[PDB]
Amino acid sequence: SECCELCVCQKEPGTFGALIAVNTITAIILVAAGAYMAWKTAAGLGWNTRPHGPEGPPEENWLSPGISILCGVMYAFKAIDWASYNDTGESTAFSLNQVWYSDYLITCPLLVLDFCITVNLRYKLVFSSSIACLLAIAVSTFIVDAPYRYYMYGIGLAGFICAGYALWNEINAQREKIPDSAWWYLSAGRLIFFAGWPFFPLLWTLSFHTSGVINEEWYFILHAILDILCKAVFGFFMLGFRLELEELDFKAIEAEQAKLEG
Amino acid sequence: SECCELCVCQKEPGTFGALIAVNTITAIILVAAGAYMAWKTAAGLGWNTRPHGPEGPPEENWLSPGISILCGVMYAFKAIDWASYNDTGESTAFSLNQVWYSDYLITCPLLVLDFCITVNLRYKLVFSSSIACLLAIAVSTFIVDAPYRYYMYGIGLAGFICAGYALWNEINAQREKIPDSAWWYLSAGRLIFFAGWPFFPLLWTLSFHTSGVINEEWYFILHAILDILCKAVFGFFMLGFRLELEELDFKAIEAEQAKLEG
Amino acid sequence: SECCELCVCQKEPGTFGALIAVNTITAIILVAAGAYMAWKTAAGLGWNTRPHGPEGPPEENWLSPGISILCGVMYAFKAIDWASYNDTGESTAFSLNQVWYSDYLITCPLLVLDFCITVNLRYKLVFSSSIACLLAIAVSTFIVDAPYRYYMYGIGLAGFICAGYALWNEINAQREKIPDSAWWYLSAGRLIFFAGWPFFPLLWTLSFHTSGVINEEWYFILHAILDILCKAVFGFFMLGFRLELEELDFKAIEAEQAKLEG
Ligand SMILES: *C/C=C(C)/C=C/C=C(C)/C=C/C1=C(C)CCCC1(C)C
Ligand SMILES: *C/C=C(C)/C=C/C=C(C)/C=C/C1=C(C)CCCC1(C)C
Ligand SMILES: *C/C=C(C)/C=C/C=C(C)/C=C/C1=C(C)CCCC1(C)C
Ligand SMILES: [K+]
Ligand SMILES: [K+]
Ligand SMILES: [K+]
Ligand SMILES: [K+]
Ligand SMILES: [K+]
Ligand SMILES: [K+]
Ligand SMILES: [K+]
Ligand SMILES: [K+]
Ligand SMILES: [K+]
Ligand SMILES: [K+]
Ligand SMILES: [K+]
Ligand SMILES: [K+]
Ligand SMILES: [K+]
Ligand SMILES: [K+]
Ligand SMILES: [K+]
């Protein structure tokens, strides 16, 4: 039928509790992580919350909490949607669970931008737009029928590997500048970027529409954990990196000022 | 049926004259207001149209006329759409009247940005993106079915109140800088922002889909007046503010130059 | 029926080879042109590929290759879509051939921006957003029914003529600055802009939905050539302009440095 054997549209009303629970929990996690990040950025500069200043926190210091909070709002909307599936058995009109990877568009162009701004990686906009385009091909690979979904997957994967290589090069060409104390958080966010991301593309090969190992319910459940790790946990490592840099900057400024007085 | 009792889809062909008229009138108003604003910005700097310069009017001086003109084009498209409802009785393919608050997305992210640029309010992009996201929840609250539209409304209203509080704080933390002559126009645009906006959210509670006091025809008619007051009249007050600032700046420059010669 | 007499939906499975071929060829052309442009921008500054520097190529030097490559990816997706029409006889779920001029949105706001950045034309964002809005009216004129498609066409054409006039003025008010060596490429990209663009609007008058001279198959075939000329060939002239400017800049810097040493 319209709903494939392994879809959430074949599940009966009353059997969606797991999905609502997972999505509410992830909404809370993402929103609260983003709220901690927001508090940390507002409260102060470095690890010891040094008073910001007249201009306040930079506007890019809000990109990171921003994504986490927005993804949490998205997940709350998804859980509201899943609750309609539990009752009415037929979703909402505004369902963020209908189009797969449609929310990942926004989130990704915002995260790659974050990384590229914080680490001062070059071609910030280039990278961010490339990822938006590769995550538009991702949506397509879920909607487009069999033979052509694999052709589209090929294009998307080629570009993903190309952009990944270029990104790797950029981070490794900024390693010299990045202090060793701040590199821990960077390498952790990179690890999240090079392992965690390829996971999204490989889970495709075992998905409900491709193979059929993971049914749509469980695919959705797994993409929630992956979002906690991207979005939320990526931002906590990037928040850490930022704070380390800002504490080291405070230290450097204070030392420069000591030498200025002396 | 698909069309609720109090909808424009239940109205017979030939009974849409009022809607076409209102929407054409508002199109004219918004476009002409934006054109006056455009002329004023191009012609000169302050109230006495002081010759601009080599670079010309700043690109942000076009955000304000821009929105008004675009909303007027939107309303012209809406009136064309309403004319098809008057004749064919079944709308156009490209109807800006189908999805409610879908046009408000663009207009709002552009207006909050305007305010934040002109008054130099901090977190410009943050505020603008927050409003875009809260006006995406607004569209949802019109499409999503009963129980879940109120859950979504709750999220939207929470964020609206949060962003409103934050905005209020920002404007009041910039009051010291803003000259008293320019504050008149600011307080008027703020009044339009804190009263006029909450009106949009309260009319929801009495709308065709929520309660049923205001049928979709009249809801549409009221949202046209509200757009004249937001968009058009908001920009005339903001244009006024800008011009006041620019005239005071011209005065300050001329005084500084007199002291430079002396 | 839903498909008009002169549409690609009336063509039988197996008769789409021409469309696939044209769209694959254009995909290759656009991608390869954009890749040459990308190589040229990365490799060096001017015509003689002068080593760039620490910061590398400006982020706007990627807007031009970018569009060409993205339009090539779009056309590859279109050819994949056309192959489904050749086999299944009913398109893909993600068809870039469904909505007419929907891809032109992105491409156009990116190209006008390019021109305005490279030639330092004023009102860059204004122009780019105007074109995005006029190319949203373009999509409408393909979907909206008879009487109202001509009303929308009128609005779109009025704005197109207005924006065209304003653009002409801007380029002619920057002619004095632009060196004569670089003007060749500029006038060629302008020629592509003032002739080539009006072609898009005039082909509308003879299209499958308006008149019926050009059926949708051949309209699609012609819009592919027009994209090679816009996108691809526009960027090769703009790449040329950029390179000329950069070689002249290198020359000027080297002369200034000779005088600095002397
Ligand atoms: C926070 C959101 C994330 C990390 C989403 C990432 C999405 C991708 C890395 C998409 C990957 C792809 C697919 C699974 C579909 C098409 C092929 C790829 C590789 C672009
Ligand atoms: C110029 C356009 C304007 C002023 C539109 C504003 C729209 C809102 C303030 C939306 C308000 C909300 C709803 C009516 C729906 C969801 C809840 C709110 C408060 C976000
Ligand atoms: C690279 C993409 C290009 C050059 C697309 C350009 C599209 C236009 C110039 C659209 C023109 C118009 C229509 C054919 C429909 C509505 C009326 C116009 C003039 C805006
Ligand atoms: K901070
Ligand atoms: K950042
Ligand atoms: K998300
Ligand atoms: K989804
Ligand atoms: K994050
Ligand atoms: K002005
Ligand atoms: K402004
Ligand atoms: K509007
Ligand atoms: K509407
Ligand atoms: K306005
Ligand atoms: K270059
Ligand atoms: K450029
Ligand atoms: K294209
Ligand atoms: K098309
Ligand atoms: K190009």
Nearest to B172 by CA among B243, B122, B231, B239: B122
Distances (CA, A) of B190 to B112, B116, B226, B229: 11, 12, 15, 12
Domain assignment of residue A252, yes or no:
no
Residues of B in contact with A41 (CB under 8 A): none
Beta carbons of B245 and B179 less than 8 angstroms apart: yes
- Alpha helices in A88-215, H assignment, sequence order: 102-118, 124-143, 146-172, 180-191, 197-203
Reported resolution, Å? 2.7
Beta carbons of B175 and B183 less than 8 angstroms apart: yes
Domain assignment of residue C6, yes or no:
no
Residues of B in contact with C174 (CB under 8 A): none
Residues of C in contact with B92 (CB under 8 A): 140, 143-145, 148
Nearest to B242 by CA among B17, B20, B41, B13: B41
User: CB neighbours (10 Å) of residue A37?
Assistant: 25
Buried b (16+ CB within 10 A) or exposed e, A199-215: ebbebbeebbbbeeebb
Our answer on whether the CB atom of B23 is closer than 6 Å to any ligand 2 atom is no
Structure tokens at C58: 């400006």
Our answer on whether the CB atom of B106 is closer than 6 Å to any ligand 2 atom is no
Q: Which residue of A has its CA nearest to C93?
A: A144
How far, in Å, from the CA of A178 to the mean position of ligand 11? 47
Ligand 2 pocket test target in B149, B191, B200 with most atoms within 8 Å of CB:
B200
Cα B3 from Cα A94, distance rounded (Å): 18
Ligand 3 pocket test target in C100, C113, C150, C160 with most atoms within 8 Å of CB:
C160
Handedness of CA A24, A25, A27, A32 (dihedral sign): positive
Chain centre distance of CA A152: 22
Give the one of C129, C147, C152 whose C-beta lies nearest to B77's C-beta.
Answer: C152
Q: Which residue of B has its CA nearest to C140?
A: B94
Cβ-Cβ contacts under 8 Å for C79 (sequence gap 6 or more)? C19, C20, C23, C24, C27
Give the one of A62, A70, A80 whose C-beta lies nearest to B151's C-beta.
Answer: A80
Ligand 1 pocket test target in A74, A100, A104 with most atoms within 8 Å of CB:
A104
**Contact: C93, A143; criterion CB under 8 Å:** yes
State the DSSP string of C49-69.
-----SS-S-GGGGHHHHHHH
Our answer on whether the CB atom of A236 is closer than 6 Å to any ligand 1 atom is no
Cα C159 from Cα B184, distance rounded (Å): 35
User: Which residue, chain included where needed, has tokens 């790790």?
Assistant: A229
**Contact: A93, B145; criterion CB under 8 Å:** yes
Nearest to A26 by CA among A212, A228, A195, A213: A228
Beta carbons of A185 and A240 less than 8 angstroms apart: yes
Ligand 1 pocket test target in A102, A112, A200, A219 with most atoms within 8 Å of CB:
A200
Nearest to C68 by CA among C23, C107, C113: C107
Domain assignment of residue A5, yes or no:
no
CA angle A223, B130, B235 (to 5 degrees): 150
- Chains B, C: CB pairs < 8 Å: 48
How far, in Å, from the CA of A128 to the mean position of ligand 16? 20
Structure tokens at C110: 């990116």
Which positions in chain B have a beta carbon within 8 angstroms of at least one beta carbon in chain A? 122-126, 129, 133, 137, 139-140, 143-145, 147-148, 151-152, 155, 159
Find the largest Cα–Cα distance for chain C: 80
Our answer on whether the CB atom of C192 is closer than 6 Å to any ligand 3 atom is no
Q: At B21, which amino acid appears?
A: A
Our answer on whether the CB atom of B156 is closer than 6 Å to any ligand 2 atom is yes
**Contact: C144, B93; criterion CB under 8 Å:** yes
DSSP class of residue C46? S
Q: At B201, which amino acid appears?
A: P
**Contact: A124, C59; criterion CB under 8 Å:** yes
Beta carbons of C217 and C21 less than 8 angstroms apart: no
Cα C129 from Cα B46, distance rounded (Å): 26
Which method was used?
cryo-EM
Collapsed DSSP state (helix, strand, coil) of residue A225: helix
Distances (CA, A) of A250 to A4, A177, A182, A260, B146: 57, 17, 14, 15, 53
Collapsed DSSP state (helix, strand, coil) of residue C225: helix
- Interface chains of chain C (3 or more CB pairs under 8 Å): A, B
Beta carbons of C75 and C23 less than 8 angstroms apart: yes
User: CB neighbours (10 Å) of residue C242?
Assistant: 26
Give the count of alpha carbons within 13 A of C117, CB side only. Answer: 18
Domain assignment of residue B6, yes or no:
no
Residues of B in contact with A87 (CB under 8 A): 147
The ligand whose atoms approach the alpha carbon of A62 most closely is 5
Give nearest CA residue, ligand 1 atom 14. Answer: A201
Nearest to B9 by CA among B84, B79, B89, B125: B89
**Contact: A73, B133; criterion CB under 8 Å:** yes
Structure tokens at C97: 């051939």
Cα A66 from Cα A42, distance rounded (Å): 13
- Alpha helices in chain B, H assignment, sequence order: 17-43, 63-87, 102-118, 124-143, 146-172, 180-191, 197-203, 216-227, 233-261
Structure tokens at B97: 């009247």
Residues of C in contact with B87 (CB under 8 A): 147
The ligand whose atoms approach the alpha carbon of A220 most closely is 7
Q: How many domains does chain B have?
A: 1
Cα-only R_g, chain A: 21
Cα C14 from Cα C89, distance rounded (Å): 8
Domain assignment of residue B258, yes or no:
no
SS3 sequence, B43-101? Answer: HCCCCCCCCCCCCCCCHHHHHHHHHHHHHHHHHHHHHHHHHHHHHCCCCCCCCCCCCCC
Which of A127, A139, A148 best probes binding to C when mutated, by most C CB atoms within 10 angstroms? Answer: A148
Domain assignment of residue B10, yes or no:
no
Find the largest Cα–Cα distance for chain B: 80
Domain assignment of residue A146, yes or no:
yes
Cα A156 from Cα B90, distance rounded (Å): 40
Residue B214's CATH number? 1.20.1070.10
**Contact: B123, A92; criterion CB under 8 Å:** no
Where does residue A123 fall: left (phi above 0), alpha (psi -120 to 50 degrees), or beta otherwise?
A: left
Domain assignment of residue B81, yes or no:
yes
Structure tokens at A64: 């990171």
**Contact: A66, B129; criterion CB under 8 Å:** yes
Structural domain boundaries, residue A103: 17-241
